[PDB]
Scaffold this active site. Structure first.
Site, PDB file in Angstrom:
ATOM      1  CG  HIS A   1      -1.841   1.120   1.254  1.00 20.28           C
ATOM      2  ND1 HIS A   1      -1.617   2.246   1.962  1.00 20.28           N
ATOM      3  CD2 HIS A   1      -2.995   1.351   0.626  1.00 20.28           C
ATOM      4  CE1 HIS A   1      -2.598   3.102   1.789  1.00 20.28           C
ATOM      5  NE2 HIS A   1      -3.450   2.581   0.988  1.00 20.28           N
TER       6      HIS A   1
ATOM      7  CD  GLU B   1      -2.875   2.252  -4.155  1.00 19.21           C
ATOM      8  OE1 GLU B   1      -3.017   1.346  -3.299  1.00 19.21           O
ATOM      9  OE2 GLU B   1      -3.796   3.022  -4.503  1.00 19.21           O
ATOM     10  CG  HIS B   2       0.241   6.353  -0.602  1.00 21.68           C
ATOM     11  ND1 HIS B   2      -0.381   7.462  -0.062  1.00 21.68           N
ATOM     12  CD2 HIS B   2      -0.537   5.291  -0.307  1.00 21.68           C
ATOM     13  CE1 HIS B   2      -1.490   7.086   0.536  1.00 21.68           C
ATOM     14  NE2 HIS B   2      -1.607   5.757   0.402  1.00 21.68           N
TER      15      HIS B   2
ATOM     16  CD  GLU C   1       2.552  10.253   0.054  1.00 25.26           C
ATOM     17  OE1 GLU C   1       1.412   9.763  -0.072  1.00 25.26           O
ATOM     18  OE2 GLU C   1       2.784  11.475  -0.029  1.00 25.26           O
TER      19      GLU C   1
ATOM     20  CD  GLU D   1      -4.331   6.441   3.125  1.00 29.66           C
ATOM     21  OE1 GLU D   1      -3.147   6.048   3.246  1.00 29.66           O
ATOM     22  OE2 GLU D   1      -5.056   6.183   2.144  1.00 29.66           O
TER      23      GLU D   1
END
Lengths: 124, 438, 402, 402, 124
Positions: B49, B52-53, B122, B129
């Site tokens: 994940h 992906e960022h 990030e 999140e």
């Protein structure tokens, strides 16, 4: 018996000329001796209401019809407990004895019976 | 009859799969990868994940800003998602902007910077999140459902990963992850809509030819999960709506019972009080629920993985004093898959599914998702004729046999969120998985 | 889409190579024509209720046997009723539409128990998004009536069975009906519509009560469920350049975990806010809107200032690169709109019902930097700016502040 | 009322010949000074809750033994706390006020269970009248903040215990407190206030956050509970002539079962509508309002047109008769306002706290027809007209229509 | 006994030097042998709640205190049914055993007792 049954059978009778010639006069006499009009009821006021279908039909009555039905029931209850009969304008005249509830219950039942049929459908 | 899906390979082992539609003007091209969070261990959980960022944070050539501009100039958009077993990176564009989009995707996948400065930036975005998924109740419920059903196993892990890992993920372990997993034999380049297959194969030879091959190339969609009957209760009296999921161990993509389980799922079906037609649905549970106002919605699911699955139902309800009835009637309808179902329900559900499996594919993105999913789980695109034959082979008596070994008297995984005081203890729920009258 | 005519009804169909057909009936019965507020929404929700030949219940049970789906929605211009099914089941769906248009029962109990509650849940779901509310409020200020009528039925203004029956008498007529078939053989559809819709009334064209008038102003919808702000500019002369301008100014990101390179996207840096420029052509008037949602009223206010600045800056000077970027984003937007079944139906519906030829995505005009800057200049120098604030309205900007 | 000073507190008392005294504490703490929306209403509702020396319960039981009464209200300028009791019970009431200002406990449970629910019922009772709502909405549009703050607490903007405690720390201070005694011996009150309010903080003068700014616009409040319309005109330079103009234009009848001879009353003929012109002086700005309520939106619309015409007609000519009638109606309105204990307290409260010397009813200026027509002309030609519609807002007029 | 009476008597003892010298050490031993801390309870968690006064006091608790109390009750119930004791951080330390509820119930009772007194007032 469902209202549907009663209405359908009655319509079969009313179609047949011979049958109607015999049944219609008998039915009118029956209604006169029944004497519900002497307590200011309409015929439909007497129908058993303690069923899901009938409770749904009663909820669909226009407010006006609903308020008038309540009054007729209360008035008849008062005649019953007093052991009196209606007089004058309280007596239901034949022309006032309208089937106000029959269309609503026939629609409720039409859907309920269609639902039962469609619950038993078989893909061909 | 839809146009045939063309399939080619490169030398490295990259699959190219395409379905052209000369009636549309847009094209979805993308890379479906047979890899996801499940490929992480406990220490690097969250890496997939995280990547992906950073895939959109700049490459060796284009900076973050140049990347933004290049896509803006193309006119379409890029999108990505990481699941437990699958990663997708796609680009929707105009017909003649397809070579640009393939080039950008090839760049972000092979030649991403993963600069320490961007990792650090990030690391906060992703930390935030963790505290905002909390609102997406369905996702909360399904993530706890996996966590408990596959307790302490790779499928049980979340995609985001724990807070601790987010703070400690390095560019080294990011690089290691994508080098080990994003190999040519695990990847499918997919084109749907206004794409020429032969053009797409050439673009693949130009951009994806220097992809590593894995040491041991297994077929696409190659995997032992040990389901745990268990419950998670996240009671919150301040929420107005209860969210409840109940599942059993379901079927994998390649199970012989795959279609049987889909038919069983369609017999229960879905319900939503906000949809006008839902009060008239044929499903028995739908009728019980709508007549008695037991729920706002329910959704049957049959989720598949390479080596296991979850089959169950997701319920939402404001009726907090009749949760017991809702759950009771739901599990009694499942019981009837074992005891009562006949050709009447089965043939009805098959009719509904024969169309449903085709209806779902209504835009280029849905078509690309279908090609990509099937190629990465089954190794091939299954034609509608084959699917129609597999559905037709399901009999009432297959459904009964399947339900008797999968549902009847079986352990469930149960997650409740919200005002769930009325949800009984595990035993009383699990006792409804059989009928004493049968 | 080969446009034709079958028994007085305009039929457009495009054959394809898919097992899935979409058949849509587009009705000139959107909210700009609503006799009573919310009546178009109620009529939409009354589709596929009991008809004389087939009950709502029977329709749903048979729809499930075909595995078909039903989609309905209301716009300011149309009611759209769409069915999705397997190609071969076309005759059934044509006949079902015919039953709805010719023979809907319209019963009081359906309105009370079925239609009105569904309409109410529809609206509450949409209003969960404060940006929806803001853009609806902006149309109300800008146009007052017609285009300013609410699209959706609300509780404060109840729709009666007589209202819906009257509106349906006007709308369900050959003059207000267009049939759009996606992946339907055009010759086959014409034959079926010609037999099924032959006894539908001819009726007359439904019209907007009154001419479209433009107004400026403010709406301050106090909610407790999120914050949004629309800055709208009513357009008296709708022009296609506003599409290019909307896509140029942009607002949403074209990329995950990004802001975007569009001016409006760059106005949101440092904030958890989103922004979207949209242009709404309604033939005789238009609306250019910029909607900003977020959790912080202070951040929304901050973005709102940068948003109007962005529009002024565009009025000054656009680069050639930026003009090309606008052409690309606009051509793409046009293409995906013609692909999506809901929007597709209404596009061709407009062409059939009005006479506005569809602009094919491949024929979308390229606007020079001169034409774009001129368009933005007109908007920055508008005499009638509309501002709709939703949420903590005391903390959101006013028109005179912007 | 003999104005004096007792331990830093301004005290005004007027002795009389009656068994009943009215003691009022006037606080510079009205809603224009509010720090958070609705706090001055909540602070008003927190008066006579638990103090350290005496519980709310004990106070009420003792008040009953004196047969006293308690009245509280909030304006844009003041909080007024008034007690009515037998003359001789004065020392008890002075001490009770001292307890409230110096030692109110301000407990969370009082806010949740006692104060906030009472505040909510207060507002719902006022809003039952749509004319109240319309005039409140008009102030909100006209001033935005300060005078534009809501007077009353609303559900959408929750007041916290910390908000109220902070506001009270500012307001409950010698600088913001005036004591007004009707039928109280002035020398006796000064002696008592001087001993009871000696240990009250001095504090500082509460001020309006920001200068008063005037704005035009529209508010459209959709209720299902009756219809009203306010036409307001903000005034930058408040002048006493607007009182005369408000009384002249009039609106209510001065006799039963009649319409009235005032220009606004004569605008209602043939309609079941009522109308009232009002002028609100707030020192640094003013508001001239005309409010129309009725059951028919069509009739309200009809009256609203005539109402604006009446104002224009007044700007043209007033006769000498009409100017004298205006003087008479205005002198009377002044006299009865100085009599009513509720308004009386705030009038002297404004003289004590601010310094605006009261205008005795016998000193009310007579305005010539020239001065009245000039005032009306200045209003008909205002650049910032406010219109607040309440009820079926789709059927009520807009500013640009008027 | 009312919480008021208990608190008042305790304060009389704490005032008296001699009394406190004897009672405080005994009370501390009592609390140690009581062993409610070994189930992770605070003393106030044990107070009988099924009275109007105590229900009112519980409703006035700040939400956080209220949520924490619920958890301590559930946790103690789980220890009870398992026949286990708290270990580690679950054991209530003496410094954590705060009288979170006492101020609320004292205010509720103060009003209730004032009401009883004032219901019996005699105008002199």
């Amino acid at each position: 018996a469902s209202i549907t049954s009663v209405v359908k059978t009655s319509e079969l009778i009313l179609k047949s000329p011979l049958l109607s010639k015999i049944v219609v006069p008998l039915a009118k006499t029956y209604v006169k001796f029944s004497g519900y009009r002497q307590l200011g009821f309409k015929m439909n006021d007497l129908i058993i209401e303690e069923t899901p279908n009938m409770q749904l039909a009663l909820r669909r009555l226009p407010p006006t019809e609903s308020y008038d039905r309540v009054y007729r029931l209360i008035r008849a209850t008062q005649f019953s407990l007093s052991h009196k009969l209606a007089t004058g304008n309280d007596i239901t005249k034949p022309e006032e004895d309208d089937h106000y509830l029959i269309p609503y219950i026939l629609d409720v039942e039409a859907e309920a019976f269609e639902k039962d049929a469609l619950d038993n459908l078989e893909v061909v | 009859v839809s146009p045939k899906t063309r399939t080619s390979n490169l030398k490295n082992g990259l699959t190219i799969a395409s379905e052209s539609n000369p009636l549309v003007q847009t094209a979805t091209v993308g890379v479906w990868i047979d890899a996801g969070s499940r490929n992480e261990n406990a220490y690097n959980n969250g890496t997939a994940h995280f990547f992906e960022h950073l895939a959109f944070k700049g490459t060796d050539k284009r900076s973050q800003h140049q990347l933004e501009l290049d896509i803006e100039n193309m006119g379409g958009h890029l999108n990505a998602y990481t699941s437990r077993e699958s990663t997708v990176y796609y680009a929707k564009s105009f017909k003649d902007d397809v070579p640009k989009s393939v080039e950008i995707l090839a760049d972000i996948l092979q030649h991403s910077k993963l600069a320490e400065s961007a990792i650090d930036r990030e690391r906060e975005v992703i930390t935030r999140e963790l505290e905002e998924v909390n609102k997406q109740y369905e996702e909360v419920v399904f993530d706890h459902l996996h966590a408990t059903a596959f307790m302490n196993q790779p499928l049980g892990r979340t995609i985001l990963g724990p807070r601790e890992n987010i703070q400690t993920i390095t560019n080294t372990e990011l690089r290691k992850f994508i080098t080990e997993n994003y190999t040519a034999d695990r990847m499918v380049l997919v084109g749907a809509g206004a794409v020429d297959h032969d053009a797409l194969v050439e673009l693949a030879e130009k951009y994806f030819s220097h992809l590593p091959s894995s040491q041991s190339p297994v077929p696409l969609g190659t995997p032992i999960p040990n389901f745990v009957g268990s419950e998670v209760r996240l009671r919150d009296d301040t929420m107005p709506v209860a969210h409840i999921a109940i599942a059993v161990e379901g079927v994998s993509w390649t199970s012989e019972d795959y279609y049987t389980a889909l038919v069983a799922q369609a017999i229960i079906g879905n319900y939503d009080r906000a949809v006008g037609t839902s009060r008239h649905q044929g499903s028995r549970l739908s009728n019980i629920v709508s007549e008695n106002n037991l729920a706002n919605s329910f959704q049957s699911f049959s989720t598949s993985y390479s080596d296991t699955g979850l089959w169950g139902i997701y319920l939402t309800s404001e009726n907090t004093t009749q949760i017991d009835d809702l759950v009771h009637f739901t599990l009694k309808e499942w019981n009837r898959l074992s005891t009562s179902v006949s050709n009447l329900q089965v043939e009805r559900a098959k009719s509904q599914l024969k169309a449903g499996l085709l209806l779902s594919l209504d835009g280029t993105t849905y078509v690309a998702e279908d090609i990509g999913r099937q190629l990465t789980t089954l190794g091939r695109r299954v034609t509608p004729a084959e699917v129609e034959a597999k559905l037709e082979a399901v009999t009432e008596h297959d459904v009964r046999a399947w339900a008797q070994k999968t549902l009847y008297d079986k352990d469930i995984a149960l997650v409740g969120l919200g005002p769930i005081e009325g949800l009984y203890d595990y035993n009383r729920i699990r006792n409804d998985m059989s009928m004493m009258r049968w | 889409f080969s446009t034709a005519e079958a028994a007085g009804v305009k039929v457009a169909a495009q054959d394809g190579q898919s097992p899935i057909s979409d058949l849509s009936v587009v009705l000139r019965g959107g909210s700009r024509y609503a006799t009573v507020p919310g009546v178009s929404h109620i009529l939409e929700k009354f589709a596929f209720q009991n008809t004389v030949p087939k009950s709502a219940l029977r329709f749903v049970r048979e729809l499930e046997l075909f595995g078909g789906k039903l989609y309905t929605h209301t716009t300011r211009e149309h009611i759209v009723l769409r069915t999705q099914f397997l190609k071969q089941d076309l005759p059934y769906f044509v006949d079902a539409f015919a039953n709805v248009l010719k023979e809907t029962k319209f019963q009081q109990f359906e309105l009370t128990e079925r239609v009105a509650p569904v309409a109410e849940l529809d609206l509450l779901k949409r209003e969960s998004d404060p940006a929806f509310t803001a853009l609806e409020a902006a149309h109300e200020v800008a146009f007052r009536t017609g285009l300013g009528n609410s699209v959706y039925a609300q509780g404060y203004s109840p729709v009666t069975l007589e209202d819906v029956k009257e509106f349906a008498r006007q709308v369900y007529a050959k003059q207000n009906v267009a049939v759009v078939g996606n992946n339907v053989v055009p010759a086959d559809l014409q034959q079926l519509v010609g037999t099924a819709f032959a006894d539908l009334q001819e009726g007359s064209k439904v019209t907007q009560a009154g001419t479209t008038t433009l107004h400026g102003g403010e709406a301050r919808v106090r909610t407790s469920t999120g914050n949004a702000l629309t800055i709208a500019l009513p357009i008296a002369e709708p022009k296609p350049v506003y599409h290019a301008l909307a896509s140029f100014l942009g607002g949403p990101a074209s990329m995950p975990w990004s802001v975007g390179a569009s001016p409006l996207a760059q106005a949101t840096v440092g904030t958890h806010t989103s922004v979207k420029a949209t242009y709404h052509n309604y033939g005789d008037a238009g609306l250019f809107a910029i909607t900003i949602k977020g959790d912080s009223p202070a951040e929304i206010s901050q973005v709102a200032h940068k948003a109007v600045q962005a529009l002024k800056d565009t009025g000054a000077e656009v680069t050639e690169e930026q003009a090309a970027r606008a052409y690309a984003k606009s051509k793409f937007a046009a293409a995906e709109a013609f692909e999506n079944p809901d929007s597709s139906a209404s596009v061709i519906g407009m062409e059939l019902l009005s006479g506005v030829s569809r602009i094919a995505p491949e024929n979308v005009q390229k606007f020079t930097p001169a034409e774009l800057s001129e368009a933005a200049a007109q908007l920055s120098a508008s005499a009638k700016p509309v501002v709709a604030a939703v949420g903590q309205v005391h903390a959101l900007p006013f028109a005179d502040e912007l």
